[PDB]
Structure 1
């Protein structure tokens, strides 16, 4: 029934996006109830970015120092504490549109939707994956800082990521809605390239299962391999080690398609060694790894039995 890289409906998040200003610096903020979230680095200039001592810079500021706006209306800040690398700002009024939500820390390989904003204004939405090296191959052209990543299960919003800095390498880094970074990074203007990335095997597998369940299986073969034997190969081509844990997860998918995980695993091995024949899997000329087995299940198995 055709495939596509879907993202969650951003509506519930949009209603929380606000702008936060300090001096000449302005970025996005997350307004949930009476509290507002934004990168603690909003309180820094071209100066305070080389080697700031946030604790020192925060005492030097007041509630009055923060300009929080709701579209085109100011929200007054009446309190403020710093948690990790994020600022928690108290405001006189609460957000009516605050949805039901949770703050969860995401695992590399997992996926989410990002609502890229500029000046607290929803600009666009897209789905990506937390790269194995904790970065994200996103499009955060200058300004998106403070934007958030999230998942929507039912009517509950799970916030997992907030954009903080535009890495020198070109990819983007951030934290969880708790101020804790995703990766070996810090909100400093120091050079700090990204670690060695890898391909998400689990996701590459779920994808091949999707292609198959989508009536396309020219890559499936006769052979079958063992786990150690698959890694020996996959790890050659820069793929992430596949574990028993990963094979479990691909269980339900293994059912539906009648193909077993090690089998499908044998197929991939063949794709890595024998190239892709110039042929295509789901229109893609390459192997897509930004679809978790869960995502596939939510796109090739409708919304019912």
Structure 2
């Protein structure tokens, strides 16, 4: 009974890039790469608790009003441009600890790492999973805007997320480094709603395989459901369509349960667990990808 737990990738490369950026009373995090610092543009808003006119804020932006710092290092701001909802600051000094990196976007249902930082101090690291609506269930609180999401893929560091805001339902909204807010959300204190959650089927199947590997089998019966039939069902029950079962071959082989037996399990279990649990959860979990589960269980 090893169980199943959300893991992060190490944060070592990312920590030395974090700086503190402030403008007026606002204080948040920046990402210092080469001679550039990146942070949410709302750092410039004179009042972030009411609707913001960003065209009017930028016009009155005076560079000298920025304070960017790390340790005893105070960076000078030589210029500042919007890149979508991200503010981009050319500073007078190159970050000697800049790692080799690239930028990419995260897709619905994919996992990545958060380094959560409080006004410049990196404080925690934990894995997250992008929800259907482009949000994540982070744990962001006051001071953590500009915290950074990243993934390591074959020895290559990708920066993928910059944190911006929290929705009424406790879901969290961020941007990629092209300055597009994931899910299209605006960077405003509008009482925006997330929209309905569509659970990732691939991920829920991964999670059920993890439970089987761990010796929990109650939710498997002597019935299965074909991919096509399951997809017809998921379109009308807030689940994603499953395009292929190839992703799960290893899990199916190791557990002797076909993906199709687990599609049947989802349809039954979505109506309720009947008092029982699965890896301690009393409801379906879609936070782990198939790949995440295979590496964690087998190290492939």
Please report how far the alpha carbon of residue 255 of structure 1 lies from its aligned counterpart in structure 2 after TM superposition. 3.4
- Pair 1:23 & 2:24 matched: yes
Q: Distance in 2 between matches of 1:44 and 1:188?
A: 10
SS in 1 for 2:212: helix
Please report how far the alpha carbon of residue 47 of structure 1 lies from its aligned counterpart in structure 2 after TM superposition. 7.0
SS in 1 for 2:29: strand
* Mean CA deviation greater in 86-95 or 20-29: 86-95
* Mean CA deviation greater in 175-184 or 218-227: 218-227
Unmatched tracts of structure 1, length 5 or more: none
Are 1:71 and 1:121, in contact at CA under 8 Å, matched by a contact in 2? no
Please report how far the alpha carbon of residue 128 of structure 1 lies from its aligned counterpart in structure 2 after TM superposition. 1.6
Q: Distance in 2 between matches of 1:162 and 1:138?
A: 12
* Mean CA deviation greater in 220-229 or 24-33: 220-229
Please report how far the alpha carbon of residue 27 of structure 1 lies from its aligned counterpart in structure 2 after TM superposition. 0.8
Partner of 1:52: 53
Relative to structure 1, the CA distance from residue 172 to residue 220 in structure 2 (aligned partners, 3 Å threshold; closer, same or farther) is same
The two structures have a TM-score, normalised by structure 2, of 0.91
Q: Distance in 1 between matches of 2:90 and 2:249?
A: 46
- Pair 1:295 & 2:296 matched: no
SS in 2 for 1:249: helix
Are 2:198 and 2:240, in contact at CA under 8 Å, matched by a contact in 1? no
Q: Distance in 1 between matches of 2:211 and 2:218?
A: 10
Partner of 1:254: 252
Please report how far the alpha carbon of residue 232 of structure 1 lies from its aligned counterpart in structure 2 after TM superposition. 4.7
Q: Distance in 2 between matches of 1:30 and 1:64?
A: 19
Partner of 2:275: 278
Q: Distance in 1 between matches of 2:152 and 2:163?
A: 18
Are 2:48 and 2:189, in contact at CA under 8 Å, matched by a contact in 1? no
The CA RMSD measured in Å over matched residues stands at 2.1
Q: Distance in 2 between matches of 1:36 and 1:160?
A: 15
Unmatched tracts of structure 2, length 5 or more: none
User: Aligned pair count?
Assistant: 299
Deviation per CA, 1:86-141, whole angstroms, max 9, x where unpaired? 11111222222222221111111111111111111112222221111222222211
Q: Distance in 2 between matches of 1:131 and 1:89?
A: 30
Relative to structure 1, the CA distance from residue 169 to residue 48 in structure 2 (aligned partners, 3 Å threshold; closer, same or farther) is closer
